[PDB]
């Protein structure tokens, strides 16, 4: 197995947007640096912004804010990729789960991005033995 | 070659392969452009390479060499002193 | 080759098949550059002289004017006087609208330009450029326009030139009327198309029942059977309609929309 | 008909109802000089008459069947008008170069649409309109 | 051999096949180390002079630059002036995405990479290793 | 050798093999580099080794020895005192 | 015969067929059991039967006569007074 | 030819091809109508044309020439002074 689960760094993001709006880095607006930071490495979302900015050469502020408020519904495009927007992909991965577990997943929404949790707290949540939990989590 | 000439060559098969002298015939055939030189080398190597095998392949291949292949072939027979064979052929064509 | 030449071959085919000793003809034709080794091997593989001749003629019927001449010359040169005489009156002239044009483009590839048309040079030239950027790869060229504007015709005269067609696309040229369609209809156009492509029935006679396998045989044929040849779509309405036709081929499509080039990968214009 | 020298092309004769017409065409292509020189591909004839889609389809299979006597293609029956049209064009171009295809008594436009690929046609009828939908030179 | 050399052979093949008496060429080429005995036996097995020449050329078309030179030299050395002259201009010098790529990989095997992509080397290399 | 020269050699086959003196010809052929020495030994052994068989193989093999093989061969004829034969050949080339 | 010995025989082809005396060599070859007598008759009849043709077939057939065919063959050369040829061969084997 | 005679010819293969003299045998074979003349020309050309190759083809083809081909063949051996070979054959037939 080779895990690809990682994600891109600042530089590559910059080059993608570069090739999409046809510039050299110095010619880029300032907001370019900021927006990528919120994009968080997924080549998908980069490909999106770089797709839309191709049409409407100045919406930059609009997306810089709209990507902030965290709602991804506003972003839509069609391309080689099979789904319109980011939300869809996730939405597909979710549905294939068993009927049993689908509830247990929802509970996990309580986590704060970047907050690592120990296992025990989850034991507290679902009210059951350690290993019994650790398996589901696995 | 028309069907009548072809038919003649088949009818005379036995006599042709029994009596045709080939070694002396090649020059004549060339002179009247009946065969190309490589065609002759191929005929020479037909089967076992005996006179009979060469003769047989000659007369088979002859059917493909034109509308006038048969009369031209009779002439080459004449030119090489095979009058008896040429005579057997002609008296059929006419018959 | 010209229809005159081809019909001359067809008329005298039986005489030719009966007499030709292929080993004395194929050599000349190979030397002249108008018969390939693999065609020659296919010929050689026939067990009898007449079967070999039959195969060779089969092959030649599909070739160009030069090839007919090559064949004729070899026949004459190898002493087949009578056979050459049969083929003499069918000899085509060898070496804007010319022989090539009506030769290759009568394959259904183009509807004849109307009775009365003014010539719009400025645009045609542009299309020739964009289309010439390829040099060959898979690729896409799109013209979309105002509803009812002169368009389809304009494309039909794009591929009229001899210089372009000969040099850049000597694979042949194809044409497909698509129009507004449903899944069933689209499927139909597919069977019809793949049927049109192979005239030698090099594949089995059977009808693929899914869009997928259709797509497949398309790609296989286009790559193997018709290398470097332009496939033209006409009036393409929807994306998923375009999805099917897509494998690794060159396409010039006319339409009203710029979007439907949406779902296809590769370079675009 | 001799203006052609060959191309795709169309020649039409329409006339009064019941006038001598069909026969007249039948003796048009009687001459030796014309037939030999201008059309040494052979000559074909098709009775069309008033028809529906089904019938028309039938005349098509029958026609394409008539064209190839050597069964150079597979034995199978095309189920749409389109593929019929196709095999027609392929054959006429390849199999029978420079040969005149004659229609008889052609009533409607869409009836004519099918028969149209890149071929020479001499049609007799009562109407001048139905040459409507076909591209190319006309008379 | 170089495409220049090979195409020169292909262009003049018929002339070469008509004239070459293989017994005076194969010896040199064997001495030079660029023709094998088994190739020579395969040649010898052809019944006529032109058939032997044809076979030999078939074999040579597949060989390297040195071989072409060996052939040319033997031709010259054995008095085939005209034939060598035909082969003179074709003498070869002696002593990422490519043809293969689009050749094999157009079999449907791969969808074309997008219009715009940055190159991630670090991972690709790993996959190549595994 | 061009086709016209080859054709000439075939047309004159009978006269060449009937009249060609070979024993005296080898030196001349060598001088003008028409044949290599081993080629000559092979021709000498052709068929039965008679003058005629040698002559025949000579003139057949001659067709392969170059564009100027025929005129060079006429010269060798001249050089060895076979003027009559050379004369028969030349008056054809020209004819 | 190993590939190096075979290769040697090919490299020396021209010299061997140019210089090998065969008529005197047969006894030697027999003595060292390099060839059976019928094999020798076949080699003697190779091609035209000239010294060169015999020589050529000898050295070709030699490649099949064993692991030690080459050194044994050099010895037979020595035994029959063909030291110069044997010397040319040996100085290669060693080289 | 019965299986026993055929088997005899195979068992004696080595001796027959080693010792059979053919050049003197043809007249005898003809006299007893064992072979037609063209058959003889074909046998004469078998393989390399050596005595052994001719001999081999003779004895192979002999198996096809009749029920009495073997005894008739022994007689021809006798008639041409090949008593030793005929003797080797007969003492087997009987054995
Ligand atoms: N060069 C031209 N000269 C004269 N008339 C033309 C010319 N081109 C187009 N037209 C006119 C006459 C034609 O009958 C008609 C056809 O135009 P066309 O290009 O076919 O529209 P279109 O079919 O491409 O648009 P759409 O496919 O959306 O219907 O337009
Ligand atoms: N040359 C002619 N000589 C004598 N009678 C003729 C001649 N031509 C036509 N007729 C007569 C007799 C024929 O039986 C009859 C056929 O005419 P015809 O041309 O077939 O009409 P038509 O069939 O062409 O019109 P439509 O197709 O509309 O019915 O007309």
Author numbering:
A (entry chain D): 279 to 416
B (entry chain O), F (entry chain R), G (entry chain Q), H (entry chain P): 1 to 95
C (entry chain E): 1 to 95, 105 to 278
D (entry chain F): 140 to 278
E (entry chain D): 1 to 95, 105 to 139
Would you copy out the relevant sentences from the publication that reported this structure?
Apaf-1 is a member of the AAA+ ATPase family, has seven domains and exists as an inactive monomer in the cytoplasm of healthy cells. This leads to the assembly of a heptameric apoptosome. Thus, CARD-CARD interactions target inactive pc-9 monomers to the apoptosome.
We now present a near atomic structure of the active human apoptosome determined with cryo-EM at a global resolution of ~4.1 Å. The central hub of the apoptosome 'wheel' contains seven copies of the NBD, HD1 and WHD in two nested rings. In addition, HD2 forms an arm in each subunit that extends outwards from the hub and ends in a V-shaped sensor domain formed by 7- and 8-blade β-propellers with cytochrome c bound between them. The cytochrome c molecule appears to interact preferentially with the 8-blade β-propeller through an extensive contact region, which is apparent when the map is viewed at a lower threshold, which provides a better estimate of the all atom volume (boxed region 1). In our model, the HD1-WHD loop forms the bottom of the nucleotide binding pocket. Both tyrosine side chains in the loop are in good density with Tyr359 forming a hydrogen bond to the γ-phosphate. The close apposition of Ser325 to the 2’ carbon of the deoxyribose ring may be responsible for the higher affinity exhibited by Apaf-1 for dATP over ATP. In brief, the disk contains four pairs of Apaf-1/pc-9 CARDs in one turn of a spiral with the fourth pc-9 CARD being present at lower occupancy. This arrangement creates a mismatch between the CARD spiral in the disk and the c7 symmetry of the platform. We also identified density in some particles for catalytic domains from a single pc-9 that are 'parked' on the NBD ring of the central hub.
